[PDB]
Amino acid sequence: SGTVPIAEELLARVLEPYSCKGCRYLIDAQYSATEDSVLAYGNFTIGESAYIRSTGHFNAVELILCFNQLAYSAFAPAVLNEEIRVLRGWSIDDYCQHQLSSMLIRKASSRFRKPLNPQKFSARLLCRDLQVIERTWRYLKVPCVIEFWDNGGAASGEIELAALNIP
Amino acid sequence: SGTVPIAEELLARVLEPYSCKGCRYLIDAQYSATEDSVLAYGNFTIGESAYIRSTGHFNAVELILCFNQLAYSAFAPAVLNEEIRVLRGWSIDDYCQHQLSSMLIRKASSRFRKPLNPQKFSARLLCRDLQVIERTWRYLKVPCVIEFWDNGGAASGEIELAALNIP
Amino acid sequence: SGTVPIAEELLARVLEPYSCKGCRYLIDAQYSATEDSVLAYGNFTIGESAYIRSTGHFNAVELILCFNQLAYSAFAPAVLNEEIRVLRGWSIDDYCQHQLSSMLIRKASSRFRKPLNPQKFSARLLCRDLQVIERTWRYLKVPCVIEFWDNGGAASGEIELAALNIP
Amino acid sequence: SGTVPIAEELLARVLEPYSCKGCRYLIDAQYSATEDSVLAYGNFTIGESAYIRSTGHFNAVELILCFNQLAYSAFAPAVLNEEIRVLRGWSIDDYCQHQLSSMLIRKASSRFRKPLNPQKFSARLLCRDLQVIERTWRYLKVPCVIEFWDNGGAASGEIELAALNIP
Amino acid sequence: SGTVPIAEELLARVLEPYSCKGCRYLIDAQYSATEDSVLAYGNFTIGESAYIRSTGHFNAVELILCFNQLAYSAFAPAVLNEEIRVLRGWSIDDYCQHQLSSMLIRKASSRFRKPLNPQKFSARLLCRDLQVIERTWRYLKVPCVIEFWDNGGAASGEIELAALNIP
Amino acid sequence: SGTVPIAEELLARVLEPYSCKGCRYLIDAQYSATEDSVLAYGNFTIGESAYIRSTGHFNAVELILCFNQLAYSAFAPAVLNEEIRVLRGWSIDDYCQHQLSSMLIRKASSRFRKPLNPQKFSARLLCRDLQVIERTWRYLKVPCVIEFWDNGGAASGEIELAALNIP
Ligand SMILES: CCCCCCCCCCCC(=O)O
Ligand SMILES: CCCCCCCCCCCC(=O)O
Ligand SMILES: CCCCCCCCCCCC(=O)O
Ligand SMILES: CCCCCCCCCCCC(=O)O
Ligand SMILES: CCCCCCCCCCCC(=O)O
Ligand SMILES: CCCCCCCCCCCC(=O)O
């Protein structure tokens, strides 16, 4: 690993958009960062779906939901301790103002094996080769890789984000 | 096209899992079917996210949410008028009992261009080469293709479903 | 890891060429796959050499023998669940017809430290950057990397395969 | 060349470990030797694989198998006529007691072009710069170079042996 | 890992420049090597600073000191068992004559989180893409990556070495 | 420049941690200061390494060692004449009690060209945009820039310090 924990209450701030909806599923997380890469791990629980009755399983909607929360979370301390080069110039204040409106999934790719236990599961996340793209929109493009597990069970994805304001 | 409409109140039954959560986004839909293929079109609106505060845009979570609703919906009249061969033996009664627990996204692939207007948008859906797979689980595998639009804007995906009970 | 197990009796089918000769040495295996990569782990035992009297150690012939069995095995479920892109179009039926005649070692590179216990040992295998080469022969070229251990002990190799029919 | 033949029945003694398994493939051989080098040539045939069903081709396992037999064979008369300096002190009696347990492949490197006819083929072998290494094990290290042919067809390798007892 | 241990007394020889100054801090180490890469792990203790009174913590000077010792150490057995290609032609005798004068840090990059316990800590080291550069000086350039830990605590660096004589 | 000299015997007090170890290398220094910046110049000599036998050159360990001494030294008169705003409230008495335990290198970045003559060399140092950071630790963060020269020869670095007590 080589990863430090992230303070709850940085998390709780970052994920308040979901918590004020009872949709925070990330219990705690640990990160590590460089000039151009972040690695994070998180532990999750799903009490109830906000959107459908009750599947009694994991869903694909919740994979995404958990990826968002972890990515959101993993980039917080990086930005704060100013470890991401391309993002120096953002305070954490900047980051939390640009969460909802300014950070987008461009393309994504999911795979599903043994259905995850929505109750106790975990994820590992790695975003790499971050690079800024100027034009008709100027965005930081963020290639990500995530993997879930828990009872066996696994899922994964390669998702590319766009983050809209920067630097 | 070559597609018939689907009665609301078949829809309303099928999508009640989302409606009882205020998360039905499919306004109406039209389908067409064969031995082994379904084509559907739908019109959507998103009043508010159930899960996050307010993005003011479309999300990836909602792409999936809309795909589910349309697929769910498109297969309803097919099963009822017994047009899907591999599914003859299901009443619509069977179908609605197997919605939540028995129908799953195996793998999926999303693409996003001009952000969709979450207020008034539409989708076109095509599932093809349905085929049953017996083994440690016996499922109908369902290769799907969907495309959204509205103001320009587009998104799309190739998602493979597993449906768990049948025939 | 992030790897699922492989059913014996898929194995037993795939490795029957060796078993009908009492030369199956792979006890069980676990794999993981992508568009263009496979990772597998296996556990081995050698009862007796088929070819020489008795060395009382591991040999280089048996390194190869074990690599073959694991590679053979690791690609089976990938092909079956159609996870390898370049190989979609093969059923598992195709695969088992092309095992003996159509899958070849082009070049290889071995290293040997602490002699492996031929009785209880294990391997880790990773094939990557698979790519098809058309010409006077049309083959899928398969760059592989394997490592053995057990009592300490280690061996390894970088072997390139050619698989002759496809796609 | 500049090479003398090797008596069958020296061969037959040396390769009995394989013959008692029906795995002797070296038909006859010729050698030449110096203080510190051996050159050998051999002619081979493979009736059937001992280990797999039937490939109908050459394999990599059999390349090694043939290298072993030829190396084993080429060093026999050298040791007997006491031509290898570092090995004087071994009778041929010593040599045949240390075959199985005491002679090992450290590292190896194979290349494969036109598939060899397993029925009628030949090899040329050259081991050079033999040198003894004392330590936690005391071995004679033996850098070797071999090349096969037959119908065209070629294969080759640079293999390093360790021989464990000496002098 | 996949790494063998390194004999103390190879270490003790290699690190004598520091030991004769009471500044050897590497207790033991394990390595693994290829044509062009070395991986090593080590365990350290710092009894007292040689240079300053007493900080009661880890320092940056000691990070470097430990990196040197581990790199010095990790390359020893590689060179001896002649596993590094570009360095074949050096005996270990060559290596120990070129330690002090001929091996240099060109550029380096350090990061520090939770202060390391100078008493019991460890490191992981990986040097890769070694390549020789001829000119006004002819050096082997050696891109390295190291990471420390122990009580939590972490530090890391990307340091590039120049080694001056070779091959 | 625009810099005043610093009295030896302020130096000698500040650097006693190194001198009592025969590791003071700063001969004399000159500084200049503002509300939030210090500039210093120093002249150095290295009699012998404390830690290794004898390289006959400059090392990276000694770059750091010299940076510490100069930074340590440059901040002394600033604090004394109370010129650093964020540090007013420290006497020089405070400063010398917090040297060893309370002043740390967070991250650092070194570059090396023409090897410095360890006998007669000089440095130029500039720390800027000092700013206090409250939290789980409350530190003054100190971004620094240093450059060495002497016979040509140059080295440089951007090092960030943390100073732990203040104000
Ligand atoms: C500046 C890099 C930002 C990385 C974290 C953003 C991840 C958020 C994922 C998108 C969430 C959403 O679409 O609502
Ligand atoms: C029998 C074919 C069923 C096709 C409609 C099923 C689509 C439902 C998509 C999965 C929804 C979910 O994961 O909650
Ligand atoms: C299509 C990729 C096939 C990968 C598995 C083939 C590995 C078999 C190794 C060669 C065995 C032999 O030479 O008999
Ligand atoms: C003393 C030199 C011995 C040279 C002949 C030994 C070659 C045998 C090759 C290894 C065979 C094996 O691993 O079973
Ligand atoms: C030939 C590659 C040598 C790798 C080991 C050298 C590492 C030594 C680091 C430099 C030590 C010093 O500057 O005193
Ligand atoms: C209050 C600012 C203090 C600036 C001088 C501190 C520089 C000391 C550098 C760190 C020395 C060490 O790690 O031992």
UniProtKB/Swiss-Prot annotation, chains A, B, C, D, E, F:
Keyword Protein biosynthesis tagged: no
Keywords: Fatty acid metabolism, Hydrolase, Lipid metabolism, Lyase
Enzyme Commission (EC) number: 4.3.2.11, 3.1.2.-
One GO-annotated biological process of the protein: fatty acid metabolic process
Domain of life: Bacteria
Catalytic reaction equation(s): a (3R)-3-[(carboxymethyl)amino]fatty acid + holo-[ACP] + H(+) = a (2E)-enoyl-[ACP] + glycine + H2O; (3R)-3-[(carboxylmethyl)amino]decanoate + holo-[ACP] + H(+) = (2E)-decenoyl-[ACP] + glycine + H2O; a fatty acyl-CoA + H2O = a fatty acid + CoA + H(+)
GO molecular function: fatty acyl-CoA hydrolase activity; lyase activity
Disulfide-bond pairs as recorded: none
InterPro entries listed in its UniProt record: FcoT_ThioEstase, FcoT_ThioEstase_Rv0098-like_sf
Family as reported in the entry's similarity comment: Belongs to the FcoT family.
Function noted in UniProt: Involved in the biosynthesis of a unique class of isonitrile lipopeptides (INLPs) that seem to function as virulence factors in M.tuberculosis and to play a role in metal acquisition. Catalyzes a Michael addition of glycine to the beta-position of an alpha,beta-unsaturated fatty acyl-[ACP], producing a (3R)-3-[(carboxymethyl)amino]fatty acid. Acts on the (2E)-decenoyl moiety loaded on the acyl-carrier protein (ACP) MT0109, forming the product (3R)-3-[(carboxymethyl)amino]decanoate released from the ACP. Displays thioesterase activity with a preference for long chain fatty acyl groups.
Protein name: (2E)-enoyl-[ACP] glycyltransferase
Origin species: Mycobacterium tuberculosis (strain CDC 1551 / Oshkosh)
Gene name of the encoded protein: fcoT
